[PDB]
Amino acid sequence: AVQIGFLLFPEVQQLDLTGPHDVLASLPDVQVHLIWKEPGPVVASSGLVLQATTSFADCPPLDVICIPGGTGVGALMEDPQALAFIRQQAARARYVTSVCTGSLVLGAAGLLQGKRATTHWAYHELLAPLGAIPVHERVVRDGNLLTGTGITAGIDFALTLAAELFDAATAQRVQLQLEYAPAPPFNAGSPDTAPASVVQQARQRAADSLHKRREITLRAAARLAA
Amino acid sequence: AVQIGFLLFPEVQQLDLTGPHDVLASLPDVQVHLIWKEPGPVVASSGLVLQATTSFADCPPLDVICIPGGTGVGALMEDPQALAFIRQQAARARYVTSVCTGSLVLGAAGLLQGKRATTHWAYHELLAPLGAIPVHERVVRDGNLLTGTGITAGIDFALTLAAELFDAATAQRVQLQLEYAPAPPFNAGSPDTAPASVVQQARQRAADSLHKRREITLRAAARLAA
Numbered sequence A, B: 001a002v003q004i005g006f007l008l009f010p011e012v013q014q015l016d017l018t019g020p021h022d023v024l025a026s027l028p029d030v031q032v033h034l035i036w037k038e039p040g041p042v043v044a045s046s047g048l049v050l051q052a053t054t055s056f057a058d059c060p061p062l063d064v065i066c067i068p069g070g071t072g073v074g075a076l077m078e079d080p081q082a083l084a085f086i087r088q089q090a091a092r093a094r095y096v097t098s099v100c101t102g103s104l105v106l107g108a109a110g111l112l113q114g115k116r117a118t119t120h121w122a123y124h125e126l127l128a129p130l131g132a133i134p135v136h137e138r139v140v141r142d143g144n145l146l147t148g149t150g151i152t153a154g155i156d157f158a159l160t161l162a163a164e165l166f167d168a169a170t171a172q173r174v175q176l177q178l179e180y181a182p183a184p185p186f187n188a189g190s191p192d193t194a195p196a197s198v199v200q201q202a203r204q205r206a207a208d209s210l211h212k213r214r215e216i217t218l219r220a221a222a223r224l225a226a
Helices: A014-024 A080-092 A102-108 A121-126 A153-165 A168-177 A196-225 B014-024 B080-092 B102-108 B121-126 B153-165 B168-177 B196-225
Strands: A002-007 A030-035 A040-043 A049-052 A064-067 A095-099 A139-142 A145-148 B002-007 B030-035 B040-043 B049-052 B064-067 B095-099 B139-142 B145-148
Touching (some): A014 A153, A014 B014, A049 B049, A095 A153, B014 B049, B145 B153
Parallel strands (some): A095 A145
Antiparallel strands (some): A040 A049, B040 B049
16 A cells, blocks of 8 residues: 655645645555644645544554645744655655745755745745755655645645556546546736736745745755855 | 635544644634634544634634545435534525535535535435536535535635635645645546545445445435435
């Protein structure tokens, strides 16, 4: 049974997690874990209440680890217990993955040093101080590392993982079962395609968060320098 | 404050709900409800545990109601309490929406009689007996009714709802904030694009479910005929 784990933390962006969870949970011979310090309720940034299924100590060795993003990433980047767990699991995992700002947590854990990676467009400048080679692409692979952008990156890369863990026909079957064929009614999902006025509104709304994360990133980088 | 409600029921396909929830919860001046018979835990078909926030009796009048799909649709199609709640809310809602097999619940409630609608490809034959005009398109609008196909239909139509409730610039801002720009690695999300061998595997796996839902649909249609 393939063991797949998601880190579930307070103020997570839940769709970063719940998208790939429903796809991967559709596969045969897969056990999916929602991991936090103890089993029990964890509140997403929207107020949605989710339920962690296992503690760090009780989690089995994972074949796939996935770090979602969200508001709550800032606290995680300085959580020594969480970072140590991620490093332990990444050592033996076949795939180490993240969605959106989840790659900043991999960065704080030291797992992006010398690695190509992406993150959310508004926070992309924080990759280089964590030792990454920043790449402006939606899915970036470097060995067993896979970082993706977009709240639904994990849906798309879950189909890639299905094809590699099983076969292409299995991935295609799951896609058809879920009738997954997105068609967004707008083309504003990148700062390169959105209107300049919209990019300004979005940057201004992210500015306080980016300022705080610059401070956190520099402390995280100092710990990696030690 | 725009009031948006999702029906949350045992054996729901959670991504049908959690996708549009995270998008719509990003909008200003929106309250989102997860509705069941009582507040408390509800288990999705994957085993993910979600939490209903309000009862039928306590739910405010909704501007938007959304019915997700999943395994659990069969029980809902013969739940008189749930169907009565859906009819009451649909009477005054600005938008009545569904994802995937959620349209079969709208059908059982009598809300598709004479209306254009879609549903999941494997169950599409069940629309006509519920009085619908079946349409093979990913998003079908008929007045204030909006039915969509695909586990992420609600993400796409949530951006349409954002543009109509607010304005296009607001919808574009949310899309950019979420960096939403899907790019599936396979093209098997429709029976018209998937390989014939994959369509066979998927039909055979749905056959027991379709057989049971034929029986349920005929009983639901008999109640509408009374």
